[PDB]
């Protein structure tokens, strides 16, 4: 649905995770990383998680801090 | 959570995960399981994924098949 605007969003995002894959990255941190990556703001307001788990190999879970956290497959 | 409305929902779903902790499980499988197990319909309707992700030790993933697969954090 977002791929309407950003046909590369899957790949931009994989790039962000790939970047953060050691500790995995939060959503807010993903949004920020994406601004900084593309020069553009992360397009999704809510149900970011539902969207992210659409991208193959993207994984999610709550950290030690109980924060939701995304990464790719080990 | 929605645990507010549904008294045993937590332990039910965790029971299903625990049973399935080997290969992980989809959402529809989780529902039909919950039915088979409680003889009742799965209570939740909208926003199930955030729910499951609220459960301690759970991990969602997107298979290369496109499937959304829930499981329990692997023990190292």
Curated annotation (Swiss-Prot), chain A:
List where the protein spans the membrane: none
Q: Which residues form a coiled coil?
A: none
What are the HTH OST-type domain coordinates in residue numbering? 5-74
Highest taxon, organism lineage: Eukaryota
Expressed, tissue-wise, as follows: Begins to accumulate at the posterior pole of the oocyte from stage 8 onwards.
Q: Where in the cell is it found?
A: Endosome
Additional record remark? Capu, spir, and stau are required for the initial localization of osk to the posterior pole.
Assembly and binders: Interacts with smaug (smg).
Job description of the protein: Organizes the germ plasm and directs localization of the posterior determinant nanos. Oskar protein is required to keep nanos (nos) RNA and staufen protein at the posterior pole.
Q: What is this protein called?
A: Maternal effect protein oskar
In its UniProt entry, the species of origin is given as Drosophila melanogaster
Q: Which residues of the full protein are shown?
A: 150 to 221 of 606
Swiss-Prot record, chain B:
Record's subcellular location:
Endosome
Where's the HTH OST-type domain?
5-74
Please tell me in which tissues this protein is expressed: Begins to accumulate at the posterior pole of the oocyte from stage 8 onwards.
Record note on quaternary structure: Interacts with smaug (smg).
Q: What does this protein do?
A: Organizes the germ plasm and directs localization of the posterior determinant nanos. Oskar protein is required to keep nanos (nos) RNA and staufen protein at the posterior pole.
Question: Other comments?
Answer: Capu, spir, and stau are required for the initial localization of osk to the posterior pole.
Record protein name field: Maternal effect protein oskar
Instruction: Point out the gene that encodes the protein.
Output: osk
Residues of the whole record sequence present? 150 to 223 of 606
């Amino acid at each position: 649905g977002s791929r309407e605007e950003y046909p590369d969003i899957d790949s931009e995002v994989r790039a962000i995770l790939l970047s953060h894959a050691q500790n995995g990255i939060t959503i807010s941190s993903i949004k920020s990383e994406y601004r900084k990556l593309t020069g553009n703001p992360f397009p999704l307001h809510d149900n970011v998680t539902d969207f992210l788990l659409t991208i193959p190999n993207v994984t999610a879970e709550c950290s030690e801090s109980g924060k939701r956290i995304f990464n790719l497959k080990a």
